[PDB]
Design a protein around this ligand. Structure first.
Ligand code: NAG
Ligand code: NAG
Lengths: 44, 49
């Protein structure tokens, strides 16, 4: 298991961007695309 | 791992014991129990799990 790696120094570093914030970024992208077309990707 | 703003700015640093539920054993470091010494920070400025 994941803990089994934690006996002999095989530590797993958690990602900086948690899945919640990845979902937040994806929701921001979706809102931008829906309510702004492609303009938001090239300026305001 | 040691969090530092890079000598230049300030020598004050903060450390991070990765991958440990430190609310038990490292927050309760006794005399020279923590690896990098300076047992003065047994409680430290703040211990944030
Ligand atoms: C770095 O150190 C130099 C010399 O002491 C100083 O002039 C400079 O402002 C410092 N920069 C920072 C970001 O601490
Ligand atoms: C971390 O330690 C605290 C205090 O013993 C405990 O309440 C908590 O459940 C622990 N968490 C994990 C993930 O082991």
């Amino acid at each position: 298991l994941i803990c089994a790696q934690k006996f002999n120094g095989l530590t797993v570093l958690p990602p900086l961007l948690t899945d919640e914030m990845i979902a937040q970024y994806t929701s921001a992208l979706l809102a931008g695309t829906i309510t702004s077309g492609w303009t938001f990707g090239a300026g305001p | 791992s040691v969090i530092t703003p890079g000598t230049n700015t300030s020598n004050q640093v903060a450390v991070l014991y990765q991958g440990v539920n430190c609310t038990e054993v490292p927050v309760a470091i006794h005399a020279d129990q923590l690896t990098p010494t300076w047992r003065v920070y047994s409680t430290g400025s703040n211990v944030f799990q």
